[PDB]
Design an enzyme around this catalytic site. Structure first.
Site, PDB file in Angstrom:
ATOM      1  N   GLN A  93      42.241  37.526  29.331  1.00 14.82           N
ATOM      2  CA  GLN A  93      42.371  38.536  30.326  1.00 14.82           C
ATOM      3  C   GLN A  93      43.533  39.208  30.366  1.00 14.82           C
ATOM      4  O   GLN A  93      43.532  40.424  30.805  1.00 14.82           O
ATOM      5  CB  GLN A  93      42.178  37.836  31.824  1.00 14.82           C
ATOM      6  CG  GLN A  93      42.906  36.881  32.122  1.00 14.82           C
ATOM      7  CD  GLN A  93      43.083  36.542  33.692  1.00 14.82           C
ATOM      8  OE1 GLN A  93      42.607  35.442  34.094  1.00 14.82           O
ATOM      9  NE2 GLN A  93      43.669  37.424  34.464  1.00 14.82           N
TER      10      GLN A  93
ATOM     11  N   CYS B 271      40.238  37.259  36.353  1.00 17.21           N
ATOM     12  CA  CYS B 271      39.537  35.849  36.068  1.00 17.21           C
ATOM     13  C   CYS B 271      38.245  35.797  36.724  1.00 17.21           C
ATOM     14  O   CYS B 271      37.333  35.216  36.201  1.00 17.21           O
ATOM     15  CB  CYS B 271      40.523  34.808  36.856  1.00 17.21           C
ATOM     16  SG  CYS B 271      40.648  35.296  38.605  1.00 17.21           S
TER      17      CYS B 271
ATOM     18  N   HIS C 293      42.214  31.358  41.344  1.00 15.97           N
ATOM     19  CA  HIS C 293      41.707  31.378  40.166  1.00 15.97           C
ATOM     20  C   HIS C 293      40.284  31.154  39.901  1.00 15.97           C
ATOM     21  O   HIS C 293      39.793  30.041  40.163  1.00 15.97           O
ATOM     22  CB  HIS C 293      42.524  30.526  39.141  1.00 15.97           C
ATOM     23  CG  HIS C 293      42.337  31.058  37.777  1.00 15.97           C
ATOM     24  ND1 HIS C 293      42.915  32.303  37.309  1.00 15.97           N
ATOM     25  CD2 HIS C 293      42.155  30.390  36.599  1.00 15.97           C
ATOM     26  CE1 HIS C 293      42.661  32.540  35.859  1.00 15.97           C
ATOM     27  NE2 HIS C 293      42.467  31.007  35.511  1.00 15.97           N
TER      28      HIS C 293
ATOM     29  N   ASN D 295      38.525  28.516  30.533  1.00 17.04           N
ATOM     30  CA  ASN D 295      39.749  29.531  31.033  1.00 17.04           C
ATOM     31  C   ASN D 295      39.398  30.845  30.079  1.00 17.04           C
ATOM     32  O   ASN D 295      39.131  30.783  29.238  1.00 17.04           O
ATOM     33  CB  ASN D 295      40.838  28.841  31.390  1.00 17.04           C
ATOM     34  CG  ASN D 295      41.972  29.577  32.145  1.00 17.04           C
ATOM     35  OD1 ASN D 295      41.426  30.510  32.758  1.00 17.04           O
ATOM     36  ND2 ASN D 295      43.089  29.112  31.971  1.00 17.04           N
TER      37      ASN D 295
END
Ligand SMILES: *C(=N)C1(NC(=O)[C@@H]2Cc3ccc(c(Cl)c3)OC/C=C/CCc3ccccc3C(=O)N2)CC1
Ligand SMILES: *C(=N)C1(NC(=O)[C@@H]2Cc3ccc(c(Cl)c3)OC/C=C/CCc3ccccc3C(=O)N2)CC1
Lengths: 217, 215
Positions: free
Chosen positions: A19, A25, A163, A184
């Site tokens: 990102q 996110c 997040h 992630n």
């Protein structure tokens, strides 16, 4: 539910994205869960445009590169009637202007589903549904520098999460041996190739079961 | 026509791909001129499925991994609707069962235009349209173990050609060259690219079977 799940080994998960210097996110979390559901449905793994969400989903309550909600992303897809592939609408890592073109849309939804806020409800879901959009408390110096093993941070919060990530499965390992396999969006050089093992069934660690969802597809 | 031409400078060209140990050169050629024409239309460059064209354009007269002609591939995209992306129908470097899905279609054509067997006529096409499907005589050693420069094979055929490629431009270095995209990976030639001799008695028949698809 099963005892040990990994949706990567079923071709349900695209490679790890990055990102970069933008707070998107939520949109990587949304396209992750939408990617897996389009996959179960169509049998084709096609990477989805996080930029399409970053640019256009402002009206449905998102803040471009300053934050957002996954369910709001799912709501945009449903209202907009679609979402372009990564290929047609590439990640430019800033909020830009809405350039959605319906001729390239490769995904859809009919809404989303909010899992009850129990770690067992998130277990059963990760097992029958596919990868799941979740939110975590990521603010700690120790998350920013993660490497391997099961992550467990004593100071982590269960109600205040910051997040958006994606849960791709779970498993075990002698002591406190259970974990969530979390994708992630900080690229491959972070964590275990971009993945973090989160502690599973230690009082909802980092609030992973508190804001969990997935799109209906 | 412009003094020199390149379509990669203008984002009409996807990266050099690789056919492997399969005879799918016509397919990579076909997808190339069709990728360049879609970019003309839309503004998005999207990579197309050779494996779609290898499996499913059989009815147009193509012979799977044992050869084919680019114009049957173009005919297949019209006689079907559109064609699927690289990502939705990946490349398996062998002849397998047909797996087309219209839900993943990102190209179209309204037909195809064939260029008169003259190099001058080809110069105009490249300059006025974009990447052009062409066919060349590649059987010769100086092509296989070739690194750099303007190619010239003294014993190259102008009648008999066996390898489909893409013309992405041309230029000058009283010398001329053809800016030709190959499908032998980035490891061969100039990053997968080759300078064919240009305006030199139709070298290797570059202008002999030249076509491009309309949109
Ligand atoms: C991602 N890099 C950043 N964080 C966000 O965009 C967050 C992710 C998040 C946090 C919490 C929850 C979810 Cl689903 C997602 O769970 C409940 C949400 C509470 C408040 C979250 C929220 C609401 C509106 C707009 C943004 C936002 C938020 O903080 N989202 C940018 C750093
Ligand atoms: C690519 N690896 C190979 N070459 C081919 O498949 C060719 C490409 C080709 C050759 C010639 C012409 C075109 Cl448009 C494309 O133009 C002249 C026509 C030739 C006809 C040859 C032919 C006929 C039927 C099936 C294939 C074929 C052929 O060799 N095509 C496989 C080695």
């Amino acid at each position: 539910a099963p005892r040990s799940v990994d949706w990567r080994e079923k071709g349900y998960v695209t490679p790890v994205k990055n990102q970069g210097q933008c707070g998107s996110c939520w949109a990587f979390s949304a396209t992750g869960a939408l990617e897996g559901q389009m996959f179960r449905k169509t049998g084709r793994l096609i990477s989805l445009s996080e930029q399409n969400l970053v640019d256009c989903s402002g009206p449905q309550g998102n803040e471009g590169c300053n934050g957002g909600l996954m369910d709001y992303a799912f709501q945009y897809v449903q209202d907009n009637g679609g979402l372009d592939s990564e290929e047609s609408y590439p990640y430019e890592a800033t909020e830009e202007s809405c350039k959605y073109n319906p001729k390239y849309s490769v995904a859809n939804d009919t809404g989303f589903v909010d899992i009850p806020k129990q770690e067992k409800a998130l277990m059963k879901a990760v097992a029958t549904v596919g990868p799941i959009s979740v939110a975590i408390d990521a603010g700690h110096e120790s998350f920013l520098f993660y490497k391997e093993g099961i992550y467990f941070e004593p100071d982590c919060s269960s109600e205040d999460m910051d997040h958006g990530v994606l849960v791709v499965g779970y498993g075990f390992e002698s002591d406190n041996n259970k974990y969530w396999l979390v994708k992630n969006s900080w690229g491959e050089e972070w964590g275990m190739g971009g993945y973090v093992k989160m502690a599973k069934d230690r009082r909802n660690h980092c609030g992973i079961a508190s804001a969990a969802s997935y799109p209906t597809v």
